[PDB]
Symmetry: C4
Subunit: 92 residues, 4 copies
């Protein structure tokens, strides 16, 4: 968690999710929790059962995916290392 | 043989048990549907349904971030340590 | 296309998609084209707007994902190399 | 500078144009919706809708297999050649 590389990826991920939450809650009229949910399932590629209704929201979502998918998967990978390492080091 | 593979297998199993319990309690799904939802979420396939409760939405966000990395680490190790050697062995003329 | 590694991945992918098409068209009652579509969008993780209705179909789908996702992405990667190489070699 | 990146960018753009034309003609989508569908399909996010015509289903299957590899090759090159250097530059104290 002290690893600056992990810390920066965390910050970038949080900032990207905040931006999506603000966007979808104000332009697409979603409750904050639903805007955050939509942002997360979009950038992790899980998807969900809704899509943006406005043209602005569709264009934003296209750009958001290309801006954010690589960072989010970089963060998920670094997070996975941190989470599994204590179990690996106990199982040695 | 591979202790990292052992860890990822056990952690994957525990992660899917946790999701099965969570979605069957909080989202009211039958256990098999809760397991299905957990699997398609963490492999990023996705489901035709989404959580309905705010607790379910929050949990799912955290489950995604922790669970994708573990499940795909397991899938990668399964491919290199189990599936690839089996394919190669099954291609040998005997 | 003569690369045996690519050829084997193609065969494995086709056989896996045939199995899913047979399964979903007979157990989940989908038309063949819809059963193939469901099999493809599942193993590529795109997803779609339906899910299996039977418990047997849900269990099959879980196992199908773990049996098939790695092969399908291996094939997609090898296919991408083949498809882009003529353009790379013309752009040198 | 990177000719592989140039190729993947152009092929990605052409792939998305092709999908926009296809889904707006065959599936009747407005152009922006056809582009949206193409992007979420090839990045594997998925859409709340699916093709309705058999032509659309067949095309989508082929588009997925050819398009995922190109779009994710482009995303990887964008990350290593553009986004990573920019982040690093923007972290330098000046
Ligand atoms: Cl909220
Ligand atoms: Cl059950
Ligand atoms: Cl059919
Ligand atoms: Cl339009
Ligand atoms: K996906
Ligand atoms: K998906
Ligand atoms: Na989706
Ligand atoms: Na979806
Ligand atoms: Na969906
Ligand atoms: Na989905
Ligand atoms: Na889905
Ligand atoms: Na879906
Ligand atoms: Na849906
Ligand atoms: Na989807």
């Amino acid at each position: 968690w002290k690893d600056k590389e992990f810390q920066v990826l965390f910050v970038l991920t949080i900032l990207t999710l905040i931006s999506g939450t603000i966007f979808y809650s104000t332009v697409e009229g979603l409750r904050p929790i639903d805007a955050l949910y939509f942002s997360v399932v979009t950038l992790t590629t899980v998807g969900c059962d809704i899509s943006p209704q406005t043209d602005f929201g569709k264009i934003f979502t296209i750009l958001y995916i290309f801006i954010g998918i690589g960072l989010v998967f970089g963060f998920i990978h670094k997070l996975a290392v941190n989470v599994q390492l204590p179990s690996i080091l106990s199982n040695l």
